[PDB]
Amino acid sequence: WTPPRSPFNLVQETLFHDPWKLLIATIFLNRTSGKMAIPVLWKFLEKYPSAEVARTADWRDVSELLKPLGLYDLRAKTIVKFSDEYLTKQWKYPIELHGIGKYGNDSYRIFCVNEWKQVHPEDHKLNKYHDWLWENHEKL
DNA sequence: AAGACGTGGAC
DNA sequence: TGTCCAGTCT
Ligand SMILES: [K+]
Incomplete structure (x- = not known):
């Protein structure tokens, strides 16, 4: 499956x-405009192109980028921890992981796994995408 | 279960 | 230049 x-x-x-990057993007979006987060996100995936790299990084560094x-402080700390657990903790759903809630988990379950039918989003853009999926899946 | 975390954009 | 505001945690 591919959304x-x-x-x-x-x-x-x-x-x-890459369910990892997708969860990072969701976190970058926590209580922050796309207009601002999205450029920083891309530069973040440049410096930290993976989870194995990221569980490693100094949070002081992630922070510089995030202010x-x-x-920025709590988040930078989360980002590092999330990445540790992402890789070292067993999970079926990222809800189980640190700093991922209904929003990140909904995205996961609509995008990384074929479960869109069962998601009930409460994010706007997600609602748009979802509503739009319900409307057009039989067409593909 | 309530804060609390936060800057710069829009205005 | 002041207020409002863009999830998940403890
Ligand atoms: K969680």
Whole structure:
């Protein structure tokens, strides 16, 4: 399964193939505008192209990148921890992991795994994509 | 179960 | 230049 590209161009639609990156993007989005987060996200995946790399990194460093997006200290610490657990903790769903809640888990379950029918989003853009999936899956 | 984490954009 | 605001945690 591979989720369709939509007319709303969510970040999730590129990152689906790597559930880790997709969960990072969701976290970058926590209480922060896309307008600001998205450029920083891309530079973050440059410096930290994976989970094995990221569980390693100094949070002090992740932080430098994250201020000016606010929520930078706690988040930087989370990002490192999330990546540790992502790789070293067994999980069926990323909800089980640190700093992933209904939002990250919904994205996971719509994009990384064929479970869209069972997701009940409460994020706007996700709602748009989902509604749009319900409407057009039989067409593909 | 309530804060609490946060900057810069929009205005 | 002041307020409002863009999930998941403890
Ligand atoms: K969690």
